[PDB]
Structure formats: C-alpha cells, structure tokens
Amino acid sequence: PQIKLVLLAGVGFFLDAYDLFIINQVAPMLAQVYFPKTGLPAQRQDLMKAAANIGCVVGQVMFGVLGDSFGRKFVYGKELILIIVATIFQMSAPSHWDGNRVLTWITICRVFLGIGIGGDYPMSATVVSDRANIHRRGTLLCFIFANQGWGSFVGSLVTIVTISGFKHRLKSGHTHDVDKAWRILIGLSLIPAFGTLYQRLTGVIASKKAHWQEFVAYFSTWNHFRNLLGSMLGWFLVDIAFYGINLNQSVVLAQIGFAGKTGDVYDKLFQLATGNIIVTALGFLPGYYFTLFLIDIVGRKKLQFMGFIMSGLFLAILAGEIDHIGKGPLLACFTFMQFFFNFGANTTTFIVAAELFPTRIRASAHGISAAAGQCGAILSSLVFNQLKAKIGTSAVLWIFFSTCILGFISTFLIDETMGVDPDEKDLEERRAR
Ligand SMILES: CCCCCCCCCO[C@@H]1O[C@H](CO)[C@@H](O)[C@H](O)[C@H]1O
Ligand SMILES: CCCCCCCCCO[C@@H]1O[C@H](CO)[C@@H](O)[C@H](O)[C@H]1O
C-alpha cells in the first residue's frame, strides 16, 4: 500500500537526523582521547560540526542537477551508499594518528556524509505533499519530520547505553577504550542504513530558461514573492539557533552544572550523556508530536509564531542568568527551548515551505527555502564555538535571541496553509484575472 513508502522516507529522515546530530555525542569523546588536557580547538571543532550541513546543501544541488538531468532512477540508491562509505572512513580513523590529523580526517568524511544526506532530504517532503492533496497533509509531513527527534533521541539513547557498557573497563584503568566507543556511536547508524538499502532494492538549457522565466514571472508579484521570502527567512532563521544548539547541545550543558569538578573519566562522560538524553527525551523529541496534533487544528502560522516567540524567551533567560544562577533553573529552560524548537518553527518552516507553493514552481521554491535553511544552519555551526571564546556564551545566546524575534516578525509574510490547496489558490488567482 501507500503506507510502506512514507515509512521508508521516515527511516531516511531518521538516519539523516541520527547522522546529523550524533556529532554532538561523539565530539566530547574525541577530546578525552586526543586532547585530554586542552579543549578541541575552536576553529577545528566548528568545521567538523558544520561539515555535515555544508555537504547537505551541496547534495541537494548536485543531486538536483543529476536528478533533473537523468531522472530519479539515477539518484535513488546512490545517495545512501555515499553516507555509508563516509561513515566507514570516519569510523576507522587510524588510532595512532595525531589529534589534529584525526579531526581533519573526520571533518572531510562528514562533508561527503552531508552530500548524501542532502539528496533524500527535500525529496521526502514532495513525495507526500504532491501525493496527499488533503487537509491531513501537514500531519504526514510532521510525522516524517518527527523522525528527526528520534534521530537525536536514539543517538542520545545509544550513548548512555554505550558509556555504561565500558564502565568496569574504564574504572579498571583502560582509559583508551573511549577511542573505541566513539567509533561505535557512528557505526551503529549502519544497521538501519543497510536494512533500508535492501528494501530500496527489494534542450536542457531551453527548458531551464523557460521554467526560470515562469519562476521569475511568478515571484515578481508581491503576494507571491512574499510567500517565498517568508518561507526562506523562517527556515533560514530557525536553523541558526536550531542547529547551532543541537549540534552543540553538549557544549551548553557544560556551562550548566553537568560539567563539574568531581568524578573520574566514566563519571564525567556519563553525567553529560545523562543531560543529553534528558533534554532530547523530555523536550526535543515530544516537540515534534505536539506540532503533529495541532497543525491541522491551530494552523502553521500560530504554531510558528509561538515557536519563534517562546524559544526566544528561554534564550534571554539563559543569557541573562547563565553566569548568575544554578544548574537546575538553567537546565529546565534549556529543555523548554528544545521543546518549542520542534513544537514550533523548526517543524512548521519545513511544513510551510512545502505547503505554500503551487506545484509548478514548488520544486524550486521548496529547494530554495530548504537551501535557505541550511544556510542559517552552517552560519551558526561554523562560528558557534569561536564566538563563545571571543565574546562569551551569554553574548552568543543574545544573538540567537535576536534571530528568534526576526523570525517572529517575518512569519507575518506567510499565508496560512492549513486546509488551503496552493494549486487551487494559484488557479483561482489566475481565473479571476
Ligand atoms: C569518502 C570519505 C573520504 C575520506 C577522505 C579522508 C581525507 C584524510 C585527510 O588526511 C589528512 O589530510 C590533511 C590535509 O589534507 C593532512 O594534513 C594530513 O597529513 C592527512 O593525514
Ligand atoms: C517594510 C515593509 C514591510 C511590509 C511587510 C508587510 C507584510 C504584509 C502581509 O500581509 C498579508 O496580506 C494578505 C492580504 O492581502 C493576507 O492574506 C496575509 O495573511 C497577510 O500576511
């Protein structure tokens, strides 16, 4: 039936999400092995974490050219093998290498990893927005998008299980086995990857200038231009804080009381992994499902309004009080923020970008909107840890705060897509004129 296809897209989203966010759990282990006395260099850590998002836009543009040039049967399988190979090379960095060399190994591997993740990422949204043509199209988009929380959650769940497995061996003095652990965290993504592989198995310039002429003609009108504008900004703006935080969630929990002064090698890693599962289970994951139950009742905008404006509130409380109040109050607000990321802008911007546009231009407008989002992701990802040392963490959170207010303001540019058919709206727009 039609069901088996959306699950395959879901596990595609899950694997992308797992592979994307698992770098947040892997980074602290690399520190203990190759840089035990000093932290990971700021510039090198930023490059490593942005690498996946950098490839993510390269993927959907390259797999866009190749997919438009030679069809869909030329990209469907090849996207999955690229992230599999990138996982293996990343997994098998020579353990006898220098710290900087190991880092440079992993950064490069994750770029190719991003290129594959970029393929099935916008392609999983169109298959179910074009197919449904029903009021319950948003809940379908949200369900596949909800796998992003499971990717972050399962990665967090995998981490505590892995760390607790090395407990006795670490306590008995075998401290280098953490070098084995971080390879296991990355490798475990291979299990659904191979399973999906089997199930997936078992006049070009004249047309590009004609669709460009229609695209330019369409988005040269205000009521049509602004819909692409708000779609581009909202996805761009939410991804700044969203990926800057979620790819650095372990860094924030280090300013909070989860990075102490007590404990040995195991005690340190386990307390940090404890906070990560708390936040992603209590906040990050359920946010997708609150969005799931209310988009076709409340509307995309009101949820986007709330999502942008609520997560901002908790960002200001952090920035003002992070250096002044205790761990408890800070942790609670951090979880609330993560909750309203997925219960709000992060999920709706993905939905709104696929729901706003008539099909005749939707591929570009969603592609540009998704590309716009990844642009915000790479911005924060590339500079997050560098700013943290130059201006301080409180100052950086004030920046993420400002991006949320602008997202709230920009959301006014969007038409509410709940229950509206963008193709029927375009047809009625034309028949009246
Ligand atoms: C599909 C996955 C592709 C994996 C690519 C692995 C690239 C490994 C890079 O090695 C390192 O490159 C640095 C400069 O390039 C050198 O400073 C260093 O001496 C060298 O060890
Ligand atoms: C510096 C100037 C900035 C101008 C930004 C103003 C955005 C105006 C958007 O209004 C839109 O008008 C439509 C009706 O025409 C409504 O259907 C739609 O809901 C609403 O979003």
Ligand 2 mutation pick, 408, 411, 413, max ligand atoms within 8 A of CB: 413
Quick one: which of 343, 26, 351 has its CA closest to 158? 26
Ligand showing the shortest atom-to-Cα distance for residue 300: 2
The CATH number of residue 60's host domain is: 1.20.1250.20
Instruction: Say how many Å lie between the CA of residue 248 and the centre of ligand 1.
Output: 24
User: Does residue 412's CB lie within 6 angstroms of at least one atom of ligand 2?
Assistant: yes
Q: What is residue 134's DSSP assignment?
A: S
| Amino acid residing at 415 | D
Ligand 2 lined by 413 (C-beta under 6 Å): yes
Structural domain span for residue 208: 3-202+204-431
Q: Is 314 within 8 Å of 279 (Cβ atoms)?
A: no
User: Is 112 within 8 Å of 55 (Cβ atoms)?
Assistant: yes
Q: Residue 174: count other Cβ atoms within 10 Å of its Cβ.
A: 13
Ramachandran region, residue 260 (left: φ > 0; alpha: ψ -120 to 50; beta: rest) = beta
d(CA 274, CA 294): 30
Residue 61 and residue 121 in contact, taking contact as beta carbons nearer than 8 Å? no
CB 347 within 8 A of CB 304: no
Residue 372's nearest CA partner among 386, 353, 385, 351 is 353
The preferred substitution site among 82, 87, 92, 101 for testing ligand 1, maximizing ligand atoms within 8 Å of CB, is 101
CB within 8 Å of 189: residues ≥ 6 apart:
15, 18, 19, 22, 87
Atom of ligand 1 nearest to the CA of 85: 1
Structure tokens at 421: 């058919």
> Nearest ligand to the C-alpha of residue 81?
1
Nearest CA to ligand 2 atom 19: 415
Atom 5, ligand 2: which residue's CA is nearest? 413
Residues with CB under 6 A from ligand 1: 85-86, 89, 101, 104-105, 108-109, 112
Question: CB under 8 Å to 158, separation ≥6 — which residues?
Answer: 22, 25, 185, 188
SS3 assignment, position 263: coil
| Entry resolution (Å) | 3.1
Q: Which distant-in-sequence residues (6+ apart) come within 8 Å of 367 by Cβ?
A: 60, 64, 122
The CA 97 to ligand 1 mean position distance, Å, reads: 11
Compute the distance from residue 409 Cα to the ligand 2 centre, in Å: 11
Nearest CA-CA partner of 87 in 149, 20, 154: 20
Sign of the CA dihedral running 89, 90, 96, 101? positive
What is the distance between the alpha carbons of residues 365 and 252, in angstroms, rounded to a whole number?
34
Compute CA distances 280 → 142, 150, 197, 431, whole Å. 17, 9, 28, 48
Residues after which the chain has a gap (C–N > 2.5 Å): 202
Most informative mutation of 48, 79, 92, 104 for ligand 1 (most atoms within 8 A of CB): 104
Backbone angles phi, psi at 416, to 5 degrees: -65, 125
- Count the domains in the chain: 1
| Separation in Å, CA 204 to CA 69, 103, 141, 217 | 8, 41, 31, 20
Beta-carbon contacts of 336 under 8 Å, excluding residues fewer than 6 positions away, are 283, 310, 314
Q: Which ligand is nearest to the CA of 225?
A: 2
Rg (CA), the chain: 22
Which approach determined this entry?
X-ray
Cβ atoms of 91 and 30 within 8 Å: the answer is: no
Q: Helix H segments across 202-264?
A: 204-218, 222-246, 249-255
Ligand nearest to the CA of 429: 2
How many alpha carbons fall within 13 Å on the CB side of residue 344? 27
The residues near 403 (Cβ < 8 Å, ≥ 6 apart) are: 237, 240, 241, 376
Mutate to test the pocket of ligand 1, among 108, 111, 113 (most ligand atoms within 8 A of CB): 108
Residue 265's Cα: distance from chain center in Å?
A: 30
**Any ligand 2 atom below 6 A from CB of 97:** no
Q: Beta-carbon neighbour count of residue 3 at 10 Å?
A: 7
Q: What amino acid occupies position 321?
A: E
The residue among 297, 247, 13 whose CA lies nearest residue 145 is: 13
Q: Any idea which ligand is nearest the CA of 223?
A: 2
**Exposure letters 175-196 (e unless 16+ CB within 10 A, then b):** beebbebbbbbbebbbeebeeb
Residue of minimum CA distance from atom 6 in ligand 2: 413
Nearest in space to 315 (alpha carbons), one of 339, 340, 333, 332 = 333
Identify which of 203, 419, 413, 207 has the alpha carbon closest to the alpha carbon of residue 308.
413
How far from each other are the two terminal CA atoms of the chain, in whole angstroms? 41
Backbone angles phi, psi at 425, to 5 degrees: -65, -40
417 Cβ inside 6 Å of ligand 2: no
Tracing tokens 């390259």 back to the chain, one arrives at 62
Spatial distance between the Cα atoms of 110 and 114, rounded to a whole number of angstroms = 6
Decide if 11 contacts 192 (C-beta within 8 A): yes
Let me know how many helices (H) and strands (E) the chain has, helices first.
Answer: 20, 0
Q: Which listed ligand is nearest to 417 at the C-alpha?
A: 2
CA distance 253 to 399: 18
* Any ligand 2 atom below 6 A from CB of 229: no
| Backbone φ/ψ region at 299: left (φ over 0), alpha (ψ -120 to 50), beta | left
**Cβ neighbours of residue 317 closer than 8 Å, sequence gap 6 or more:** 333
Which of 400-433 are b and which e, b meaning 16 or more Cβ less than 10 Å from the residue's Cβ? bbbbbebbbebbebbbebbeebbeeebeeeeeee
Q: Which residue's CA is the closest to the ligand 1 atom numbered 10? A: 105
The answer to whether the CB of 319 falls within 8 A of the CB of 395 is: yes
Q: Is 393 strand, coil or helix?
A: helix
